[PDB]
From Swiss-Prot:
Domain notes: The SH2 domain interacts with tyrosine phosphorylated forms of proteins such as SHC1 or PTPN11/SHP-2. It competes with that of GRB2 for binding to phosphorylated SHC1 to inhibit the Ras pathway. It is also required for tyrosine phosphorylation. The NPXY sequence motif found in many tyrosine-phosphorylated proteins is required for the specific binding of the PID domain.
Assembly and binders: Interacts with tyrosine phosphorylated form of SHC1. Interacts with tyrosine phosphorylated form of DOK1. Interacts with tyrosine phosphorylated form of DOK3. Interacts with tyrosine phosphorylated form of SLAMF1/CD150. Interacts with PTPN11 in response to IL-3. Interacts with receptor EPOR. Interacts with receptors MS4A2/FCER1B and FCER1G. Interacts with receptors FCGR2B and FCGR3. Interacts with receptor FCGR2A, leading to regulate gene expression during the phagocytic process. Interacts with GRB2. Interacts with PLCG1. Interacts with tyrosine kinases SRC and TEC. Interacts with c-Met/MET.
Cystines in this chain: none
Protein family per UniProt: Belongs to the inositol 1,4,5-trisphosphate 5-phosphatase family.
Organism of origin: Homo sapiens (Human)
Protein name, UniProt field: Phosphatidylinositol 3,4,5-trisphosphate 5-phosphatase 1
Record GO biological process: apoptotic process; determination of adult lifespan; immunoglobulin mediated immune response; intracellular signal transduction; negative regulation of B cell proliferation; negative regulation of bone resorption; negative regulation of interleukin-6 production; negative regulation of monocyte differentiation
Gene this protein is translated from: INPP5D
Localization, UniProt: Cytoplasm; Cell membrane; Membrane raft; Cytoplasm, Cytoskeleton
Primary localization class, coarse: cytoplasm
GO terms, molecular function: inositol-1,3,4,5-tetrakisphosphate 5-phosphatase activity; inositol-polyphosphate 5-phosphatase activity; phosphatidylinositol-3,4,5-trisphosphate 3-phosphatase activity; phosphatidylinositol-3,4,5-trisphosphate 5-phosphatase activity; phosphatidylinositol-4,5-bisphosphate 5-phosphatase activity; SH3 domain binding
PTM text: Tyrosine phosphorylated by the members of the SRC family after exposure to a diverse array of extracellular stimuli such as cytokines, growth factors, antibodies, chemokines, integrin ligands and hypertonic and oxidative stress. Phosphorylated upon IgG receptor FCGR2B-binding.
Keywords of the record: Apoptosis, Cell membrane, Cytoplasm, Cytoskeleton, Hydrolase, Immunity, Lipid metabolism, Membrane, Phosphoprotein, Repeat, SH2 domain, SH3-binding
Amino acid sequence: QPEPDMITIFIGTWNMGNAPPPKKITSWFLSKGQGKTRDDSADYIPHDIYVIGTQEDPLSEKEWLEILKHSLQEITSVTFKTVAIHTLWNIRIVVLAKPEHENRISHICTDNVKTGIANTLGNKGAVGVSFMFNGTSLGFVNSHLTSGSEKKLRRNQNYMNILRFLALGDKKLSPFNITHRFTHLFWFGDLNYRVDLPTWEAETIIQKIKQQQYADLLSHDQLLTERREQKVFLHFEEEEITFAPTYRFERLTRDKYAYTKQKATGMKYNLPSWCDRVLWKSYPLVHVVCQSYGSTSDIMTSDHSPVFATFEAGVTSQFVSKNGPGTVDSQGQIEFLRCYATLKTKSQTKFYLEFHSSCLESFVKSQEGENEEGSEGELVVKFGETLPKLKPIISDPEYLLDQHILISIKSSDSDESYGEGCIALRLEATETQLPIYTPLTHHGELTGHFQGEIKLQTSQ
Ligand SMILES: *C(=N)c1nnc(-c2ccccc2)o1
């Protein structure tokens, strides 16, 4: 029975509003309702992996697992295996997988981050799960960020704390945060960004929603506008939104948005907003295609509607040759020519590189580059033709062209990373000098660039 080249992943995010769910929630897992919905002809076809993020979840892990496994069994006639479950307060992530995948999944990790200090510490944060699926690393984050239309900067701060401190994936990747540790990273939840229009426009907003005219609302969505200004979620993707705002509904119908200020809201307005979101980030030139992104119309116990997203995601096998794992394959090599890092730092220490990859026995440290000043004031770290020749464990091009090299540029003085990025080996040619490029980030913020040329030798 062959190993897969592609799987499908369901992502769900639902703020349950501290109320039990209704008897039937199958529409969520079927990607039915509003937006980009799944074809009816696919209803019996199980996804390979289901990742379910809840916020304001009143249920025990046991009670929710029961409901989820029953719902999928009813849809698919498959009994799904629990990969992981992790709860922080009322923020929960469940990962279920087809039973045929139980021996494909390893290195399962869970973690949580609590956001804010004292007053703002005690209900907002994130939970996460990671694991390996054969040769592919998968990460999943469910975050409940700060609420309130006036708090987009706090939401962005919450994102940066979660990014920095959530401990998932391979601990040997020490310079790298969750935004570089996974082939595919999915980040979802009640991100709590709002439609930033005047509160006196509430009824106008509601009439735009009733007409399914979202353009003038999305142009004021704080997550889209903060992403456009590179304030948050740098280098993540989101599918176009074609569903109505998922918040804030009167419970037990979807006919009414409840937006007016009340004692229960802290005398805040809740203009209709896309609070509930799914974003992703995959390594360069890995297949990932959003197949659905929408909200359910028939699950009405919460003041939020559930959001679904589905993906086709490229995966790779657990490659074994006669040589690696356990030794190098003399036929393989990775060379770097005419490379330099451009950094935004005002500091003047020496820098070196670290190359990290699953295709290497362990990470490689370069010698120091040569600092020059750039035209427009910046630091240019020149590596020229000085970078090491990397020795992959396997030389087979069917393995090696599917790999990636993570790069960290580190201060010689402090050994701290000033920038992280990733280079795909999915090249147009082997034995040929080709341009390479990655942006460099630190704490998820742009710090510079790395560019130069690569030359890849495979056994072909
Ligand atoms: C999760 N807690 C965890 N720790 N280490 C790893 C891991 C090791 C090797 C490859 C992938 C992940 O995951």
